[PDB]
Structure formats: C-alpha cells, structure tokens
Amino acid sequence: SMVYMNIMMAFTVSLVGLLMYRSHLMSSLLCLEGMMLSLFVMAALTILNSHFTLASMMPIILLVFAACEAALGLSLLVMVSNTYGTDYVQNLNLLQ
C-alpha cells in the first residue's frame, strides 16, 4: 500500500552525493549504516504478513554482517585520522 511507497522513498538515504561527500567522512559512513533499516524494515514488512514461517530468520542475519561490515569500515576511519587528526574527504594524494 502506501506503507511501501513510504518507505521506498526512504531508501533514498544513499543519495550518492551524500554517500561520500562532503567532508567529515563520518557523515558519509553515517548513511551507510543508516541505509540499513530501509532494507531491514522493507524485508520485515513482506515476510510477516505473508506467512512464510522460515524466511524471517533472514532479517536477523541481515544485521549481523552489516554491523561487522561497518565496524571494519570504522576501523580504517580511525587510521585516516590517526595519521592526520581530521578525516576531510578532500584529502587526495593517489591520483587516477
């Protein structure tokens, strides 16, 4: 119903201009963990009314990697501030 349009409008918390930009890179890793619960909820609304009885273990497992994923990504974001003190995505040295 309208309970899916909101929330499919709320999947646009990626929006890629604000998925790596601008600086204070913690603001970009924020919406990477906040892009979940637009997948954790959008799955949970579908498994639950339509009684699948078995696929509802999948929303439990959906958090378990994305927590461990983002925790890894947060380890490296200390290493960019361990060498500097500021994350500041307009750091660029290795060109392309």
Binding site: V16, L19, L39, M42, F65, E69, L76, N93, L94, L95
Partner: protein, 344 residues
C-alpha cells in the same frame, strides 16, 4: 603473522565458492560480502599512508556495490517469492541488478575503481588476487543471463574498450598500464554474453593465464617504464626476450595465442547477423596495442643502460608456476580445436 596470513588468504577463495555453490539469493549475498571483508588486510601489510588512503577508496566503492544487490533481491522477493538464482521477473530489478554488479567488475562507467586502487599499493607483489574479484560476479552473470535488457549490457561494454583504451596512452606507471587494459579485457567478454554465454569463459581462462604470467615477470625489481630499461644488460637478457613474447601474445597477433579468443568469438558474434558491432570493437583494440608496442620499444632495443651498477650475484626469488605459463599462453593456438568442448 605467518599462519594467520594463510587463513585470511584461504577464506578469499572460500568466499567465492559459496557464490557458485548456491541456489538461494541470501547465500550469494554472504559470498562476496566476506570477500570485501577479507581483502582489506592484504592491502595493508607494510602500513604506508598511501595504502591506508587507497583501501578506503577501495572499501566504500565495494560497500555500495554490495548494497544495491540486496536491494535487487528484495524487489523480486515481492514478485512471486522464489529465491532460486534465475531470471529476475521484473525489469525494475534486473536494471538495478546489472549496473550494480558492474562496479565490482568495474566497467567503463563506475570508472576509477581500477586505477586508483592498483596504483601505489606498495604491495605490487600481488594483487594477482584481483583476479578472484573478476571471477566471482562472472559466475553470477552465467545464471541471470536470460533476463537483461540487451542495451545496457552492451552500452557498458561498447564504452568499455573505447575508454579503457584511451585511458592509458598517457601513462608511465606500469601498474596502471596493467590496471588499464583490464577494463578492455572485460569489454570483449560481456559484449558476447547475450549471444551464447559460453565462449565467454574461453576469454576468461585465457585472461587469468596471460595476466598472472605478467606479474611474475615483473617481480625482479620493476616499478616504472624507465626501470624496465635497466635490466636487459644487467639482470638477464633472456628476461627481455620473454617479456616481449607475452605482450605480443596479449595483443592478439595470430602467430601467438591471444588471437585464440577473438578468432572464435567473432564466429559467434556474426552468425547472428550483427556485423557493425564487432567491426567497431575489432578496430578498437588496435590502439590497445599501442600500449604494448612503445613498451617493447623500451626493453628490446638497449635504450640507455646507464648508472653502472653490477648485479654480480644470482637471483633467488620464487617464480612459482612460471616455467609452464609462456608455453600455454603462446603456443596453444594450434592445440585448441576444442578447448570450447572441454569448457562447454
């Protein structure tokens, strides 16, 4: 450190098996999730501040390219609820599928994943390990194959060699020259995938061999093209003759065996009354050869071995499985009447 370096390295290929051994979209999500978890240490080993500022440019590019895939699963969860790996039953899903997965294999859009990582990682040693990540999603496009829009998979592939070609004539750093022409050899195989999706794997198995044997040749000292001069008269002059043979083979010249794919792959591209499509690409990989000529014009013509430094000692690296690579990567063109009946 030594034992845990295997267990990290072992699970990289264990991540990609579950991608292939699966009948269920949840397990192919886990499959190259943990590859993006177990590559990040290999980027690091000597802790240099470009490498830390390179894997983090590697990282989030393969976090979103992960994340759109799970979006593509949950759309056709709503439509008919089957989770076998097959056609995706929705054009709004398959469109979001193919150009999500085009970042991990990086095509011509989703551009600078390929040069900005591979350049300047102080681990130039290998980084042959970037052949698994070209191998996992190709094992996903073998099944999804009869559900695509046929325009997007070509438009990412017609742009592939036209922009992977031009990108590297303006280079010296031979890691970038290996990083370039790695989009180009992803251009020949996905231009064919809608038409008879085997005789795609023929191009891939050739591409693993010819690229793996290129890095093993590079592991004496070689960093830059000017350093590729100063080992003919110093290290071994037989190395200069070998490094000529593979490049001239990888350009696609018919006395060698990099002409083995194209010769066969046009047997499939026409026979389907599509003629203006191969004639564009076949003339496009011609300035993919002007990398290699003008690279062979460095080492094979004695271009200035100055700064007298003698290597009066022998060499003891490990050139593992090297004696059998330029004997199946050059001389196989007569001996393959059917490689495409073993692999088929």
């Amino acid at each position: 450190n030594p034992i845990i370096f295997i267990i990290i390295l072992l699970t990289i290929m264990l991540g990609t098996i579950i991608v292939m051994i699966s009948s269920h979209w949840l397990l192919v999500w886990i499959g190259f999730e943990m590859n993006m978890l177990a590559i990040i240490p290999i980027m690091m080993k000597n802790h240099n501040p470009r490498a830390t500022e390179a894997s983090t440019k590697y990282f989030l590019t393969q976090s979103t390219a992960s994340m759109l895939l799970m979006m593509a699963v949950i759309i056709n969860l709503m439509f008919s609820g089957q989770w076998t790996v097959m056609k995706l039953f929705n054009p709004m899903a398959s469109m979001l599928m193919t150009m999500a997965l085009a970042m991990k294999l990086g095509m011509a859009p989703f551009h600078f994943w390929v040069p900005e990582v591979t350049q300047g990682i102080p681990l130039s040693s290998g980084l042959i390990l970037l052949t698994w990540q070209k191998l996992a999603p190709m094992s996903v496009l073998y099944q999804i194959f009869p559900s695509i829009n046929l325009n997007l998979i070509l438009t990412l592939s017609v742009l592939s060699i036209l922009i992977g070609g031009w990108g590297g004539l303006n280079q010296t750093q031979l890691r970038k020259i290996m990083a370039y022409s790695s989009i180009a050899h992803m251009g020949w195989m996905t231009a064919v995938l809608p038409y008879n999706p085997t005789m795609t794997l023929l191009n891939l198995i050739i591409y693993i061999i010819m690229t793996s044997t290129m890095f093993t040749m590079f592991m004496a000292n070689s960093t830059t093209t000017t350093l590729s001069l100063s080992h003919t008269w110093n290290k071994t002059p037989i190395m200069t003759v070998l490094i000529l043979a593979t490049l001239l083979s990888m350009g696609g010249l018919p006395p060698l065996s990099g002409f083995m794919p194209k010769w066969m792959i046009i047997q499939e591209m026409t026979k389907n009354n599509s003629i203006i499509l191969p004639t564009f690409m076949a003339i496009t990989a011609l300035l993919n050869l002007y990398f290699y000529m003008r690279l062979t014009y460095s080492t094979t013509l004695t271009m200035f071995p100055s700064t007298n430094n003698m290597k009066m000692k022998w060499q003891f690296p490990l050139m593992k499985k090297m004696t059998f690579l330029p004997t199946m990567v050059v001389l196989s063109t007569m001996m393959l009447p059917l490689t495409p009946m073993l692999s088929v």
